[model samples]
Target: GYKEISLKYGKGAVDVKIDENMCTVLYPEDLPGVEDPMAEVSRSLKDPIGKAPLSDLVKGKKDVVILASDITRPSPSHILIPPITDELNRAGISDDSIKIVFGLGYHRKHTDDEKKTLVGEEVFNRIKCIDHDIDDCVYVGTTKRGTPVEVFREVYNADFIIATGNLELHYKAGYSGGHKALLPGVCSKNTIEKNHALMFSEGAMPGKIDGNPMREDIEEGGKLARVDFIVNAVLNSHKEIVKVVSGDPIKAHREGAKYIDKMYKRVIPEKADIVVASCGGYPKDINLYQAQKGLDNAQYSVKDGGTIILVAECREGLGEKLFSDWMVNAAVICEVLKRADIYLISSFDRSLTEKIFFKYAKTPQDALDEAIKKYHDPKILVLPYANSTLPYV
Candidate 1:
């Protein structure tokens, strides 16, 4: 029996047993992390794809802006910044000429400890770091999708802009990285709402970037921002860097995204009758908003009428207060999805229930126990690292 499957939940692991003949477990390929992440990143910067090295690009440049992931994202900006700053120094660019901007998008400001944790004490002490204030943004033009391109003034005014992020499957923008740092990262509240509203469209689903309107819109917005270089990485389940992509924003990002697709995308023989998934524990399952990614990923491998049991700790409760309020007030998932257009939305009936049902559980065993009562001999699919795994038909 393929019983006793291990799952992650809230910085810990749990075990669940199920009938082997009726259970299938899906996971990403076992790729090893880099031996020396800093060295590899430095090498990528020197021989970047589709553009000159970071050193050459920084020559004659005065104001430099480095876009860093916020506290919510698990991009190892501390290690990412060291190689970059080393390159900048090699090109004669001083710390005084540089500024690191947290691509906060519409998220709230981080405390001093959170900021230090993001960039590390060494980098924090050496350079100027600031949060992207919504009120301080400058209007840069709009994308064809009508997403207003309001970005932080510091990033917009920089002589050279470098975006750093990790490659991962995103519930909305196909994949996270690349131009996303420009769009929701530093964009204003208005821009985030306008762009995020596209989540209702088909093109914004997880792991589908090519021809994705929301992602395309973000890239267009990045082009408008004139981002000179990008440094993105791919991480294994342990959150260790395995690959790094640098240089031309679109080209380099696409290159890294292809690797992500190869690593995270799995094709199941068929949709299961019941899906058991986790948000990969700790930071991923830290809150309901963040754990939503795990639910979205599990949905890919579930039958239309099948049940989905999401294992998330949600220690922080509903991560977003606004989203929490919506969930609290709404009776069903459809109402939650229509948050942006509340006025025009209506409740979903029984017909929509089968395809869009979700249940929260503290452990996979608990979810499976409840699911067993609903269906007789239900075939199961277990995703131990749902937050980092994406299933494809």
Candidate 2:
């Protein structure tokens, strides 16, 4: 699926668009020490304020609440829980005095199994973990910038708050994880909505990650919440915790931003007339709804008229139940216009909603073959992993 071609033929800086579903890639040089992610964050937080470790901040504090993002995938549980318990114990905080809340922003509530997947079995059983409904969260009024802040009731009541989550490139929010774990993850629905709505503004539009206005607005919320510390991990293509970034959410995030820029900046198409690749990574392969990012990324790097072969082994089926019903009822072409690129894949999904939605086609070539007969052709730069690259691109 690789072919060589020179740009001597035409055009500007080939607009390189990376798929947003891939995990954020970290350079090998940027990886943190072998210590736990939370501990590292604690070290950073304490170093800045004083030489006090995280346990010092929480030791005499009456109540500590740790808010985190809900599980969309089976991520590593070790990143947050054990360190939280250890820090609490070191600080002489009692088990009953601690609270753990799963911040389910706009997403559906986790089932029993998903809860276990999110917080780990031991942590889930040991603590009084609550699932938050964004809308139901207490209205804490607005921020200094005029965006309303819907505070998490648990967070509001707690004497101290800490956030823990993964950091990855996200479609709407630029990058996921980090302080977002507080603003939208556990904060009130109003705060989440305000922050998310800002994405539609001039500086916060989709497809733009670093320096995104919406992301900055969310961080502003993090500061308002006065989150004591954060433990954010940057994963590799395999979802391994290669870099455990911790400390003040802002500083830690800045460090992660540098790492993302270094690793995912640009991937020159391997001079291919046709490059076949799968969007077969986790969170992406989880559903066809998420797989469209692959098509978009391929569209950017592929040469005009050359083909992009997309191999997706999706098993979870289309994400939304109503998606199939609506797709069947609508005018495929017209409805697909709402999506930015990859119209062919959209049309095919609408026309043949059943087969490709959940079934695993073997290779990127086969998918492209099916798509090319209808969508015409272009050089494709397919991504088996998109989330890891979007930040840099």
Candidate 3:
């Protein structure tokens, strides 16, 4: 091994460092604060929506429809939905008249408890909430780029469409907010599959909201579906509103993405041969399945042949067996290099018999050494808790 590698979990005496500067900004507008950040975001969103006045955009409108991202696993409860709701109310839109759809995409339906926890009772009682069933939704054909454009049948019919979500770290799509909530989260099954099919493709990468081939395809899909405007918010670690941004999906989202890049991206790590990180903790570190994304994100920092040190306790074992099984059987990056091997040190089920080994050793040293021996060189950066940090503070 290039250097002796070790791991640590923060539970006091570990001297855990909370590196605020190390965090990446998920949206460009996610700055410090705004008066009623959510409302500010909502109103700002209505400002320049394809030559439509903010008041004329939704005022006196009827049967309006709205879409938002529903947190699947460790639900994001701290986002600013209430302020957006308040802004809508002031715009003369009644709660019952507005329909709120849960853009589940591929995630399973939320249990009653999870739903309440994800979106509060006040908003739930007011809006007609529907989960996306890809089959039932209408499918629009592929864009010029060949990416399919699937959308909710109702979204097309509605006079106005508003997408609300928080911008933060996303595994594949960079940040999981803004226009993304409309495209992949709410679209029909076929469209969702097509967009996600690009995940492992070289086209997808960090800070790739637009201009990238993959993001270009996604933007075309949004435009074809007639998405009017987007309302996005960013939160600090304590769930406080740091910055809120709203308006044109392309223009506003680009503004937000720039803010995210400035806040979250770093120039130094771009040159690192080996990048180390965690899932951030709590819900992000709940298990290996959840923790895998951190590796995918940090992998951007590593050179093509460089290593990534993922320190995930993966306390809950594999997050989802179906996803796990697929990765186990599928070809990996290491396949290109006959001698290089991927290694993992964790206490989980050893599904892949040939390459994987399980460790029940009490300390971290035993596990790292065992996993690294076969791989030759191991230079790792440790992530204390690997489950909670995704997209927000």
lDDT of each: 0.77, 0.55, 0.56
Kindly give the number of clashing pairs for every candidate: 2, 17, 20
lDDT by residue (76-187, candidate 3, tens digit) is 3324566556667878888876777777887787666655556677777766667777666676668776677878777766777877777655545766566676787778
**Candidate 2: 10-residue stretch with minimal lDDT:** 6-15
Estimate the TM-score of every prediction. Answer: 0.74, 0.65, 0.69
> What would the TM-score be for candidate 2 when compared with the true structure?
0.65
**Between prediction 1 and prediction 2, which has the larger lDDT?**
1
- Error (Å) of candidate 2 at residue 35 is 11
**Model 1 agreement with the true structure over 203-253: per-residue lDDT tens digits:** 777778877888988899898888889998877767788889999998888
Stronger candidate by lDDT (1 vs 3): 1
284 in model 3: Cα distance from truth in Å? 5.5
Candidate order (TM-score): 1, 3, 2
| Position 140, candidate 2: lDDT | 58
Q: For this target, which candidate reaches the highest lDDT against the unseen true structure?
A: 1
The superposed Cα distance between candidate 3 and the true structure at residue 145, in angstroms, equals 3.0
